[model samples]
Target: MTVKQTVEITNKLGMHARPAMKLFELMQGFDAEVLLRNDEGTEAEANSVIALLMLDSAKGRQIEVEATGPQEEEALAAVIALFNS
Candidate 1:
């Protein structure tokens, strides 16, 4: 299962290290490969702390989140759960 989703960063807090780390943590639980690429410029892997930090994702920036492999939905849903709160 391969899936791609593009979501805009609407949170005023942006994607700081803490949130990014949490996202990566959730991703680790799955067997899928996930990548979060910034439209602004940098290409960051969703499961990488350093790569995600390089995104500099400010409020309103759009990002492309893609996942491939068996547990793609599980991984994506976990990342989205962070924003649901």
Candidate 2:
């Protein structure tokens, strides 16, 4: 099964180095494959630090996160945690 949600980057960090690494670390706990879609309709796996960095997900950027797998719910929950932090 697959589920999706969108969250805004309200922090000043802009998903930069620290936040980027934090995101990468968070994805390690999930069995579901997480992904992000930019405003341009480009999509990439959330587990990929390079992909996340390439998107240059700066502050105020909105991205859609999707997870598909047995643990999708839990994975989505964890992804939300990152934004909340």
lDDT of candidates 1 onward, in order: 0.64, 0.62
lDDT (tens digit, per residue) of candidate 1 on 2-81: 87676666662125766556556755677677777667776777766778767665466776667787787777556655
How much does candidate 2 score in TM-score?
0.70
**Model 2 spans with C-alpha error above 4 angstroms:** 12-14, 17-28
lDDT, candidate 2, equals: 0.62
Q: In every candidate, how many clashes are there?
A: 0, 1
Clashing pairs in 1: none
CA-RMSD of model 1: 2.4
**Residue 57 Cα positional deviation in candidate 2, in Å, after optimal superposition:** 3.8
Q: lDDT for model 1, on a 0 to 1 scale?
A: 0.64
For model 2, how does the per-residue alpha-carbon lDDT over 1-85 read when each residue is reduced to its tens digit? 7978776767532345465454446556656776766655656576566667655645566767788777776776666666545
Q: Which stretches of candidate 1 lie above 4 Å from their native place?
A: 12-14, 83-85
